[PDB]
Symmetry: D3
Subunit: 288 residues, 6 copies
């Protein structure tokens, strides 16, 4: 829920190991430009130049700790950012500060870009009175899923499935390989047991009812026009009152209100991670 | 750098290693949904649903090699994508094909997203009859730099410096820490020696002259208005005809042509990687 | 989850990586004994000297692939092992076959040891005509969880939750820290959202009611005497017919049937992994 | 020797890297249940619920240090454990305490289970007046050999060979590949040189004498009945007074005294690692 | 430049991760000899027994920090070493001191051996009045390039190219695969762009002029006798005044003065890393 | 240890892993020079330009397998190299062949450099008609120990102890910390038990006697003058005829014969790895 508690989701060793791979990527050997500046103790401020939502403090602190620098934060995680906000101050030896700089901003810029999109979508969804959840997807940048999912949460969206072991997601392709919806859910059931849930994407109302009848827990009504979506949803809820319904496909920040209806429990958008632009931050040294 | 020749830049062990870590990220332990489909030999078509430029084949192939699947491509790297292009076919056991799917689509979506953004930028700069390079920056998604830099190249843009190990890049922060521009170039010169180039971020003509004076191979005029840009470039280049001039900051697709001019050799944009929307691809099983 | 189909749950790169690290553990540098035998092509039989259930083939195959050896299997995964079953044959250079031997036997001994324990448990619970799942726990040997969970499945038991990323498991410690059961479920609900299930460790009927009250999908009645177990389960399930009931703690093979009852859906035992003796296998060269 | 000094065998970086892989296994991404408890500073006690021998403190401290928690010990390494002993207290933020919990107990439970078996075997062996060593084997859980060998030592058993580079062990299979005992020892000799020892398992008295005559340092009399074992041993010692003799195969905690004779220097048991049940520990939060 | 500032080139995490792999190599499991000494706090002195130049402090401190030991330095990085110099004192628990010992000396011995050769070559080159740079090569020990390049720098030599991404080096083989010098430089140009430099090794004067004419930045005059080298150099400089010239091949500490001429900007020697003997250091415990 | 049989000591996964990390070191990201040549199938000859002994084929093959290239060898491992021997041919895509080149040459140069040094040492000691082993030490390049120890073996020297996990080596520092020689051996004996040998660094006859007295298998007489060496060895060996004697320190090629004597079993030299110049190899494309 509240953005500041979300940092408890991240084990410190995980953050350090991650900050380490990123820095290795950016400077795998020697850092020549360190000779340009030397190591005098220095101070920089992180400035937010785009509007949105601050997300990524834990990764950010971790990166800078890998180059022996410390960060002091003026804004809490999940704060609205308004240009040109003095977000934080970073201190350490000049060469170490500037080595951490690029990696830290790249991370923060994207973590916050996702969180901003998430929050814009969630706020819009709220506007309609809808009580449902706005969710992300598995359309994340390979290697960088931890950061992107955390961004989503900071923006107030639900992670949805983190990985291929969190809930048994039966998609289009799986149905076809299985030879029909009933057949797919049947193997999904054996795979899920009591621990995991089963979600099946459906193209029609028959499929959605066949799904729920087989023992699906959630129904993903995929790529419906909203005109055809909500009656199908009401219908499914009418024959199956407990079954969660999700709506996905061709959803955008602009068209999202249309997708918000009383029989829809979840709306997921790929654009939260696929088309969320990075926020602009800078880090500038200052004297004192 | 003809499109298909760019694949030769990537060692295949680098590709296997990257692919492995991405599939690990997506499925760290058991793959329950495998029970849904079983393992019958299957085939899927990869469809491009967005217009643009195809990039990422070599990563795409390694991803599917890691779960023992083969790929035949109908479009070469660099191709203009027109919806709904049938772009490749993938064959392998049904469960393995579908394990590979998400990561492979997620990768290609972004690599092609970046190539698309670059190619568009290049077409614009070249339609002005400007004969410089359109460049990318170091503003890449942490962990995903090889794919994004490779994407940039496929789109005809220049990778620029791959990392802090290449050309010695002197930024405002470096100059400030160093106590001045010449002083910084002086440190930069011992860093670079005879093997590496020196570029210097300058935000004024005088700063630019002092940089070229102390031996900088390149001068980066940063966050100028186009109006101050060319007179300054003409000035510096008049006094130093051998020094390269890069412009950057604020540059977008819509406004690129006004940065195109005779005394500009390089134009970089953050936008090629920070605001590049991914392409929509799908992977669909067929012929049961 | 038919026996042989369970192999499909394991990505082969995961298997190669695991096998590699185990052989590394056993032989970090030089393999001196290789000089003893030389490299002539050789063949060995794998013998099962203990009764039980065979599990571990996919790990077994990857181990021997890493030292370039091939395996043909005469018994399918899931098979009842009767001494002295000839279970497979392994071929490869003599030195490579014998490097692979120890790790491969050590692995299969344990994976089959766990499957054996589970299958026995299942046979007992099912001979009572109880229609629930026999489950394992998270009490697995560190580093060896994939093998032990895979072993459990081959024996017909349920993996339960693979890790802390799956269903949100609320234990006594969690409830205490959270200051109470509902309060904890409340935190659990925001953790799980719509994708993940919530299970709650309850050691009394009232605690169980408050858990099901605040929305828990499952209630784990822990360290009950069988005598208090069923009346409590009947109670909770009477008030909440949709909530799953798990029993655990104290459960062994000898005493399992008294935990089998109508209002118990899941019975877990620590014993399946903590007290499961490994099977005796040997690998013997033949036909010089 | 004395159990408390054995911790000096373990390099701190080795323990940390190990604790890190185990935690990554158990929670590879986000820790949802952290939201259930929050991060308030908390305290738990480690309770020993089974009898035996405490082993594993160094790994245990290392795990908890990876999640920023501290442990205070009331029992020294190698102490007899009597239910329900208050073994130690762990302190740290509640979510970090509970994240370390499962992994720490799994490790300790098994390290101590091995050490308990070891000590039971060693005590029994002592009972007969026998001055020999009781040893473990290479029948260890793959990936977890460091912990299991350390357990053995804490229980007072000797590690035997840690890996395939510690002494040149010529087994059944190796003899056969080599074409006889003399031939095998001959290559073993060249492989061992002065640095390593040569041990050859023998099936008869001829083999044992051929072994010793070839230059074996130790003879492993494998799978003899004790009636046939000790005369063979005396015989071998009589023709070869310096040659170490080991007895192995079908040895159990119950039958071990039979195997203790004056001409036997070592008795090794696979059951110390293959059939040693885990000790029961718990960790319970407490208020103060 | 000045040897003491060169340590700023090395990110601390890089040094730690490196010190960690080296120690793992040397003791992958248990450290038996720790029982011989125990853990009493101890002190040792590092003695320099060979003449030369001290190089490697940062790696050295990092190794000892991995085994919880501290080092105090009496000589600065880049100091001349004269037998039998008391270079530094190391303190920590005795077993941890002695575990760090071998790895630390091996590193330092070689880092310093390279630096000594480098300095001997650089001093000799200076003797002639020559203003050029003395460079190393890519003939480094695999895995240990960071240390060897740093040694070179401490000795006052320039790193030259660190890796295959620092400058586009067109060698003999590449020319042949490309089908001539012009063809090679043409692809090198496209590969380099503005960021990287292009160096082409040439066998004759024609090749060197063809190189410079194609747009090479540096010419490597490879394996010339000095009699034929300097006129070729003057010639090339005469038709191309900006183009850097490097001389390489069959250069030794003894013959190097012959290679120093006014038209040579760089002289590189493989013997700086291929034939530089290790310096002799020891570490001896002392009482106090 | 016949030359070609030594290849059997190396697990091929160890080789793949090593090769991978070396190519990573040399080319962490993009390989720009690949554009220079393209990918046409090509062939190169490996030439030996220095006299000596060939060692490193198995590493050489793995290096070229990692960039998909094949190798045919015309000379077996252990061969005497006479300039300019055509030693192998390598085939593969031109860009891949040249990526592999540097690392493969760098490796073989050193591995053959060490083998050359050892073989020479052995020939000298054996030409004196001395029947002991010439040994190496633990003074190996960090990270490169497998190659250097393998190199030593190919040259006919003995690897000695591979690491701190093998024989318990008691050095002067160990003895000092332990407060005395017997005391140290006493600790060493419990460390080694029955599986591992004990060697003790002694710099005087009396120290040597106390070592052999307390049960040391080997006595290392360190930094003796040859003149004190043999009378001491004769002495110790007269009192203990079963204890091995190693001499070391100061030993070079030129002075080796005076260390060769009847009561010396092992002679080690630092020189085999610390002062062993690498062999000059080249790799040349041919037949366009
Ligand atoms: O795979 C899961 O992680 C998952 C969770 C929620 C939605 N999806 C898929 O995401 C797709 C939504 O993509 P989009 O870009 O059209 O918003 C939709 O077609 C579903 O198949 C997938
Ligand atoms: O570090 C690099 O290699 C690098 C290469 C090209 C550009 N940049 C930085 O990119 C900055 C602005 O890019 P933009 O389009 O995101 O505003 C500019 O200030 C440069 O210092 C950085
Ligand atoms: O963490 C899990 O996924 C998990 C799954 C199933 C069971 N457990 C725990 O196992 C405990 C007892 O098991 P046992 O058989 O070893 O006494 C019980 O208190 C549960 O909290 C834990
Ligand atoms: O391989 C060594 O690590 C080793 C050391 C001591 C004993 N062994 C083997 O261990 C076997 C003993 O197993 P067990 O389960 O019958 O007690 C015996 O047959 C020997 O072959 C093996
Ligand atoms: O590849 C670069 O790293 C590089 C930089 C400077 C010199 N070289 C090569 O190094 C060779 C010099 O080797 P040497 O051992 O003869 O001094 C020469 O033939 C050049 O091909 C190579
Ligand atoms: O640690 C080892 O395995 C080891 C094996 C053989 C020799 N050494 C050490 O090498 C030292 C001298 O070798 P050198 O030739 O470099 O002077 C001597 O004091 C031994 O302690 C060390």
């Amino acid at each position: 829920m509240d953005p500041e508690g979300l940092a408890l989701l991240l084990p410190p060793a995980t953050l350090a190991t991650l900050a380490d791979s990123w820095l290795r990527e950016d400077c795998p050997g020697l850092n020549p430009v360190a000779l340009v500046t030397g190591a005098a103790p220095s101070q920089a401020v992180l400035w937010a130049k785009s509007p949105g939502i601050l997300a990524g403090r834990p990764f950010f602190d971790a990166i800078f700790a890998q180059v022996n620098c410390q960060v002091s934060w003026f804004l809490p995680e999940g704060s609205k950012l308004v240009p040109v906000a003095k977000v934080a101050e970073v201190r350490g030896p000049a060469h170490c500060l500037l080595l951490g700089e690029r990696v830290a901003l790249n991370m923060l810029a994207r973590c916050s870009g996702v969180a901003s999109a998430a929050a814009t979508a969630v706020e819009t969804a709220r506007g309609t009175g809808w009580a449902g959840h706005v969710a992300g997807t598995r359309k994340t940048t390979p290697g960088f899923r931890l950061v992107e999912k955390y961004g989503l949460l900071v923006g107030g969206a639900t992670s949805h499935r983190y990985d291929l072991g969190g809930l048994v997601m039966v998609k289009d392709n799986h149905v076809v390989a299985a030879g029909g919806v009933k057949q797919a859910v049947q193997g999904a059931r054996r795979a899920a047991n009591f621990a995991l849930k089963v979600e099946v994407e459906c193209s029609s109302l028959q499929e959605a009812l066949e799904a729920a009848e087989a023992g699906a827990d959630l129904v993903l009504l995929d790529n419906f026009r909203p005109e055809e979506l909500h009656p199908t949803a009401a219908a499914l809820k009418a024959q199956f009152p407990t079954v969660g319904v999700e709506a996905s496909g061709g959803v955008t920040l602009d068209n999202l209100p249309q997708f918000c209806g009383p029989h829809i429990d979840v709306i997921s958008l790929g654009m939260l991670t696929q088309a969320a632009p990075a926020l602009d931050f800078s880090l500038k040294l200052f004297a004192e």
